[PDB]
């Protein structure tokens, strides 16, 4: 016997991650998640045994371990554009928009009392932010309108719509709200518009569907225990659970992973 | 070599979806919840409408 | 943007129901349930999609809705003879009993300390209520007794039983309780009785097994919101859950339904 | 419309039971359980419908009720020799023992 | 979902094609206020535009 | 078979001569609802009109 | 290559039949069966080939 000294620990540490290039195993640089409120490591280990058939009832002659899937789940509270690329399995795209003038667009079916987004194209699919000079005219819905060139006040069947009591626009997002009580836009009426687009740098997170491989690392600085840090040479980050946007608590993103093996030499988990 | 060594893995599907509630109850949201359609009609002003309950 | 005004609502309203005649679709008149403490409408909607097999892994090319079963459950607190006909899947029977005299009945096996019901016939199967003049005699159980006519004090093997210390009768229900310590009725002893039946109108709820079709309607008068009322042209009322008779809370009857479709024109749900 | 009067109820009552003779349907006398603290009646009713196959997706053309099993559970607090015959599925036997002397027995 | 967050750097979501379906139950009478639980499932519009666009 | 398909571009079939024969069994009593399984075999009416016409 | 649009289908339809008079080929009027829960079309096609012997 002896007077023994245990190693109690409270876990506090940062979690790092570096993606691999697509279809290869080259690093790209470890990113910083943020404050991860939990970081668990679980193991599902099924076995396989053989009960002997020479004496006794169900005597275990030999057993062996089939698999031991090293994995775990974690959440994170820092929400930037970079972690949403991992949760939505997508990629950050830092683009701009072209400063164009006289951008013309048609809305053929119209119910009044409905929002409308200006400029849903293939270049900027989520919309156009920044509108300088807005003008629109109305027409009957049974007439097909060709706005291939020229102004819209000069085309046939056009009637200029007053800006008061008929619609309402904000210029920081380019959103048209047709009024629910607008006598000029009642009936079966279509609308052709024009607007001017500014130029600013904007960020999209285009959420495709591909599994993201990479290495995981938790450097820990424990406040009461002898600290130690973990390293996973290859995991596969997948989204887990739900991502509740609105509520009372603060928004967390629950992740999960599954530690694979990089090659025939380097193994799955390295505790330093 | 080995017992259950993961040589390669891949993602079959990733179903992006979600649920939400709403508290504003008008005639327009009930068309979405009941999978139906709003019908704004009238009734004909008729007189001497006769009906039997057997 | 705008200053928007929501439509908040607290639901309070009455629930109506009219049965159909058996094997047809004719109405009979909407009954009033009572205060229904809850009335829910749920929808189980399974879908069917087809993942594309030309590019990508599990890309949804097209999806469609197989079924959308409009249905719901509700409870009710008003317990009369009319709602028990719906919960027990039966039918209210408003009958009478025939005012007869000298009604004679035999009880061949007798354990003492047991209740006995007078007049379990095919006309009034639950019993006979209202007894005027009760007399009974005892005999040995090995002797078959024929009480086809005449009084019972004059038949063979008869011994008149004293009313004190041997049995006990209430006349409002016609129930015989043989005393647990009665020396006159100990052993293997049978009993033949006589009694007189009064005449009063009585109500039974004969609980058969048939599905009850009908239309459902909830006219609502909401105390804080813009009210609106529902109408189901054909549902099928079925009993749901349990009906706890004794306890602390007040007795509720949980129902359920499943909105069918009346014909090829009228659909399943009409919100006004 | 009207001023309606509901029928609210708190359930308190006694529960009676009379056995049948074995293999027959003859009564024997209703016994008294005691204070039964609960007495519920539940119904498990599965149905059978036929979705039409001429127009639409899963349009209920006709439905019908297969079974409606009327049943229930209850407890009881009075424990005598008579209710234990029902719970243990047995039978009360009121016997005696023979007054004998010099009863000899071995425990090996 | 255009969001105007009271404490964080706000951002808005866009789904090019979903399929709104009713979910859960719609309790009419009770104590709390009536809510309608919906659900959706983000499909893909064509071979170019993908399922989710965070701006 | 005139078809009115709920999700696809509908089309209808026409067989100028078949021979209806009973097939399988016709279970009278049971749990499911009684169905009658038929079968046929598309013959040819003459030397001009063929066996199957999809419109 | 292109952005192709398939033709997916769920089959729902009615099945009609008109008898012939006995020993002839004259029509008599198409009857309505009812809801037919399935309607399959199968083809048994045996072939005949000749393996070369040169």
Residue numbers in the entry:
A (entry chain C), C (entry chain A): 2 to 273
B (entry chain B): 56 to 109
D (entry chain F): 2 to 109
E (entry chain B), F (entry chain J): 219 to 273
G (entry chain J): 2 to 55
What does the paper say about this structure?
Here we have determined by cryo-electron microscopy (cryo-EM) structures of the head and tail components of YSD1, a phage infecting Salmonella Typhi. We investigated the structure of the recently characterised phage YSD1 as an example of flagellotropic χ-like phages and more generally phages with long, non-contractile tails. Samples of YSD1 imaged by EM showed characteristic features of siphoviruses: an icosahedral capsid and a flexible tail tube of ~220 nm in length. Cryo-EM analysis of YSD1 allowed structure determination of the head and tail components at resolutions of 3.8 Å and 3.5 Å, respectively, and the generation of de novo models for the major capsid (YSD1_17), auxiliary protein (YSD1_16) and tail-tube protein (YSD1_22).
The 3.5 Å-resolution structure of the YSD1 tail reveals a robust but pliable assembly based on hexameric rings strung around a central spine of the tape measure protein. Our structure of the YSD1 tail reveals that the helical tube is built from hexameric rings of the three-domain tail-tube protein. The rings are stacked with an axial rise of 41.2 Å and a twist of 19.7° to form a right-handed helix. Clear density in the cryo-EM helical reconstruction allowed structure determination of the first two domains. Only weak density is present for the third, C-terminal domain, indicating that it does not strictly follow the helical symmetry of the tail tube. The main body of the tail tube is formed by domain 1, a sandwich composed of two four-stranded β-sheets with a long β-stranded loop extending strands β3 and β4 (β-hairpin). Assembly of the tail tube involves the formation of a continuous antiparallel β-barrel connecting the largest β-sheets of six subunits on the internal face of the tail tube. In the assembled tail, domain 2 stabilises the hexameric ring by wrapping around adjacent subunits and locking them into place like a latch. Unexpectedly, for such an elongated assembly subject to substantial shearing forces, there are relatively few inter-ring interactions. These interactions along the helical axis rely almost exclusively on the extended β-hairpin, which contributes 93% of the inter-ring contact area. The placement of negatively charged aspartate and glutamate residues in the assembled tail tube appears as a right-handed helical track through the tail tube.
